[PDB]
């Protein structure tokens, strides 16, 4: 799948394409996600 | 991902890992003959795993 996972800029914690938000510790709709740009070199 | 998954390599790797254990204090004692340096016992740093 071309979506890969979304990895949070604060915590750096990976949480889905279906989850709206991160939550690794209270990250808690911080919405500070960017997806895996979908594969390189 | 899994952490390369397939059961069929994964089990046999785990068997060699169980097989690489110390000899059991006893077999040194009843015993026939040997400085029982077991010997097919393999290491995380050195030489290299085979199948």
């Amino acid at each position: 799948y071309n979506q890969d996972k979304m990895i949070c800029r604060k915590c750096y914690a990976r949480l889905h394409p279906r989850a709206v938000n991160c939550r690794k510790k209270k990250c808690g709709h911080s919405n500070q996600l960017r997806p895996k740009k979908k594969i390189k070199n | 991902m899994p952490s390369h998954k397939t059961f069929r390599i994964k089990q046999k790797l785990a068997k060699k890992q169980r097989q690489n254990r110390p000899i059991p204090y006893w077999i040194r004692m009843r015993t026939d003959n040997t400085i029982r340096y077991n010997a097919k016992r393999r290491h995380w740093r050195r030489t290299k795993l085979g199948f």
Binding site: - | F7, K10, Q11, A14, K15, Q17, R18
Partner: protein
Amino acid sequence: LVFIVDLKADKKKIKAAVKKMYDIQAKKVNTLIRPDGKKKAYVKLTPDYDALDVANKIGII
């Protein structure tokens, strides 16, 4: 309850096997190959018959 099982297990046969031999309904079963070579199975049971007094007659820690 936590059993070690055979390597040509599943979850349906164990959900049956446990049911026969210990008289309890089991709700889910979770299955692992182990570095043992053996299959480690966690068996979650009905609250109608609790793992504690299921266990006591074949005590386990």
